[PDB]
């Protein structure tokens with residue numbers, strides 16, 4: 001392979017205690033004589049799938065658990081196999097966060113939730129509601145201070161307000177039912193936008209700016225997680241950590257993350273990685289070394305959490321976590337976050353209205369499942385000759401009309417391209433599940449080139465139907481669903497922006513109408 005044998009390379013995000021983690025690596029190195037290297041690459045969560053796909057990258061990847069389902073689905077993670085005794089050392093619900101399709105795909109490290117952090121010298125009694133913050137900012141501005149600054153560039157930080165009055169990601173998971181465009185989400189984001197319009201916040205505020213402002217005593221409040229407490233300690237700001245404000249009488253609902261460590265499927269060092277994670281890091285001493293660098297939050301290791309739990313900052317973290325919800329770990333989470341990130345930034349800046357911004361995020365978040373519903377149904381009915389009688393469910397009008405349109409347009413495409421498809425198939429030689437995998441790379445290569453239009457998309461899906469018919473004929477009907485998922489994957493990740501701009505499959509229906 002490409003990853004070196006007999007050594008460990010670990011990647012972790014730059015806002016975490018990577019120096020403390022390096023200490024743990026040194027202790028492992030001292031015992032074993034085996035080199036451990038801790039790195040904190042930029043855009044880590046995007047770099048890992050890029051390099052791991054080629055069979056390269058680190059032996060161990062750290063991130064919140066929401067990204068790991070996508071990694072596992074893409075074949076990038078090893079199943080982990082802790083023995084019963086080790087599993088019993090960590091809280092069951094932390095294991096639940098890293099279970100994907102019935103398998104454990106990472107070691108859980110710690111539970112993270114955003115809290116309200118406030119400067120007790122400026123604001124001894126922090127607001128219980130978001131609604132009182134405009135007036136509070138006016139009081140503070142007279143003193144040369146501001147009420148609240150937090151990172152507006154990452155949707156993680158604005159999510160608790162969006163979800164407060166009823167916004168949600170995926171309905172508990174139906175990846176076709178998304179709640180980012182409902183009345184509650186709209187209310188939450190509008191309030192944020194109004195704060196900006198009324199000069200109580202600045203749309204350009206990012207993590208570094210908000211952190212510097214709070215730690216310099218310029219703003220009374222910020223929103224952040226336990227990793228941020230170390231830098232505040234150093235600043236000597238007199239701070240407290242408490243429950244997030246309510247919105248319209250409802251608790252803010254942070255998305256709860258479990259910091260987790262996965263093992264690269266391509267690593268020749270899986271046993272070394274196991275040893276390091278189970279017997280060095282996930283121990284009282286290992287977590288303490290990391291926690292002393294940047295606080296982890298409520299750790300997954302029971303023995304050590306019983307100590308941390310006595311910390312009021314940790315109690316506050318858990319209180320907020322209990323009002324929030326554990327993030328899904330499904331593969332669509334990345335698309336969801338990118339969609340909502342764009343919506344918040346565009347609404348904040350005025351590039352889009354709140355309504356249009358959240359509409360696009362809805363469409364972006366539902367795109368994979370909506371597309372899969374259509375493509376899967378088309379391929380299966382083409383292969384078998386009979387339609388699926390199951391109700392379409394959520395956004396059923398769109399799915400149904402898109403499928404109707406696809407049948408009508410696809411009929412001609414398959415008829416006209418029949419000879420071309422026969423030739424393509426003979427060259428590719430798709431005979432089983434392994435072949436459909438290889439087919440993906442070919443498609444991502446050819447489909448990326450040239451002007452995008454609905455005609456070309458129908459041709460891609462029509463070839464899919466042609467291949468599905470073939471798979472059925474040679475008694476490989478089980479390969480049709482992974483074929484549909486592969487085509488959907490290619491479509492959605494090469495044409496995402498285009499598709500959202502067309503308003504997804506609604507654009508498709510309108511384009512070919514009558």
Ligand SMILES: OC[C@H]1O[C@H](O[C@H]2[C@H](O)[C@@H](O)[C@@H](O)O[C@@H]2CO)[C@H](O)[C@@H](O)[C@@H]1O
Nearest residue numbers: 013015064066067112154155156257337
């Ligand atoms: O903003 C979307 C982003 O949110 C979460 O990332 C958090 C992470 O969980 C925290 O540990 C800390 O590093 O802050 C991040 C936000 O900047 C999701 O885990 C992540 O996948 C998502 O993109």
Ligand SMILES: CSc1ccc(O)c(C(=O)O)c1
Nearest residue numbers: 442443446447456459460463
């Ligand atoms: C298997 S490559 C392929 C198949 C059908 C198509 O329509 C396209 C394309 O349009 O790029 C590519």
Ligand SMILES: [Mg+2]
Nearest residue numbers: 356359360503
């Ligand atoms: Mg739109």
